């Protein structure tokens, strides 16, 4: 992540991020709504960061330092460039919505009143089809990636030294290769939990309540489609085991 965004999302909540003299001007219901919107953006910033660790630290580091057999790095990090494109674009829209909402003279005081429309756009049309196709492919390749990782770590000395080297810093404690893969798979199922809680505190404007209700339905439809499109790939699986599913 970049320092500007890290600092904007360093606090544990929106109520601790804004100036207290700004917080004091708002009703409790607005503060409860803003705290959950802040959590959605903060966790999206962290999810994009997980994808940058996978693409820049692990994937590129393996291509530039190790002599792995072709098709091995793609097997460890399936769809990571596509996932990075989807989420970096989504994160850009969320951060621009916050930026436009800042008070003049402030880099931290804002209220986001219109999130629903952004969520409907993300979870409908071509961007939703791209999310569905990419997660169906990623989640079907999840178990294969973990097994490929475990095999390389146990048998390749240079691979083991590379992993131990790049994951030694304390900031990588929660972000080893297998941890990144599960963090990405679990990201999509966090969205209904966050959206439902934002909706709970967005009844003040009927258009916003309706938009968040539509967004929640779209996210659930996307998840149902992804869940129905998953069949775990297994290295060396025989056709007979596949057609006898």
């Amino acid at each position: 992540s970049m320092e500007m965004d890290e600092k904007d999302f360093a606090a544990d909540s929106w109520s601790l991020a804004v100036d207290s003299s700004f917080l004091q001007q708002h009703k409790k219901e607005v503060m409860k709504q803003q705290d959950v919107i802040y959590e959605l953006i903060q966790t999206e910033l962290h999810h994009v960061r997980t994808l940058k660790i996978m693409t820049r630290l692990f994937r590129t580091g393996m291509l530039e330092e190790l002599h792995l057999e072709p098709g091995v790095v793609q097997g460890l990090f399936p769809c990571v460039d596509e996932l990075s494109d989807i989420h970096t674009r989504f994160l850009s829209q969320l951060l621009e919505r916050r930026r436009q909402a800042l008070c003049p003279g402030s880099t931290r005081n804002f209220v986001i009143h219109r999130l629903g429309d952004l969520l409907i756009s993300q979870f409908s049309g071509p961007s939703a089809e791209q999310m569905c196709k990419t997660y169906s492919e990623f989640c079907s390749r999840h178990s294969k990636a973990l097994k490929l990782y475990k095999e390389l770590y146990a048998r390749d000395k240079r691979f083991q030294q590379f992993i131990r080297k790049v994951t030694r810093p304390a900031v990588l404690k929660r972000h080893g290769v297998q941890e990144c893969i599960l963090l990405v798979t679990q990201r999509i199922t966090k969205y209904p939990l966050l959206i439902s809680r934002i909706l709970q505190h967005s009844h003040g404007i009927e258009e916003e309540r309706q938009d968040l209700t539509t967004a929640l339905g779209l996210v659930k439809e996307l998840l149902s489609n992804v869940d129905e499109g998953i069949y775990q790939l297994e290295k060396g699986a025989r056709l007979q085991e596949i057609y006898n599913r």
Binding site: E39, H142, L182
Partner: protein, 178 residues
């Protein structure tokens, strides 16, 4: 330090997310209680042994039968949660959660955990349950369920007061080491 992996399972209203948050921060958040939990790697020392215990939540995965099992590979200990203010959450343990965990995590110890133990003597809770001919889960009901499902053990805690929380994760670490 050896690395172990813990996964918590249970119904949506069982309090699993709150339990992971309170343990990982060592406090019940006073300003904002997070909606979700990403992951955490706890440094735990139990009975003289140092372990890095990776913590994972299955919240949000309850309705997705093909995404949810992706949380299980290489799990060392399962916390199977129910809420003491919800006898319905205890009923789903033996024939929904238990056969799933035994299938994807064979031979992995399961600790049955009764969450929200502070609500057992809460007047509002007792009034609300008595309208559906119910009462908070009794300690013997939790123990008998844990015994029935082949659990490694039975424990109770309250994420709200923190009581029992440290003990659950220290025991989970010992189970993961066996």
């Amino acid at each position: 330090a050896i690395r172990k992996k813990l996964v918590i399972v249970g119904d949506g209203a069982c309090g699993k997310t709150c339990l992971l948050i309170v343990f990982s921060k060592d406090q019940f958040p006073e300003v904002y209680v997070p909606t979700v939990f990403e992951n955490y790697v706890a440094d735990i020392e139990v009975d003289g042994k140092q372990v890095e215990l990776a913590l994972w939540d299955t919240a949000g995965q309850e309705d997705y039968d093909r995404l949810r099992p992706l949380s299980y590979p290489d799990t060392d200990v399962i916390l199977m949660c129910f809420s003491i203010d919800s006898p319905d959450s205890l009923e789903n343990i033996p024939e929904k959660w238990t056969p799933e965990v035994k299938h994807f995590c064979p031979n992995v110890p399961i600790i049955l955990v009764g969450n929200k133990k502070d609500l057992r003597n809460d007047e509002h809770t007792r009034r609300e349950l008595a309208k559906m001919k119910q009462e908070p889960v009794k300690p013997e009901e939790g123990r008998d369920m844990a015994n029935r499902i082949g659990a490694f053990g039975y424990m109770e805690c309250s994420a709200k007061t923190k009581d029992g929380v440290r003990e659950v994760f220290e025991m989970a670490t010992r189970a993961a080491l066996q």
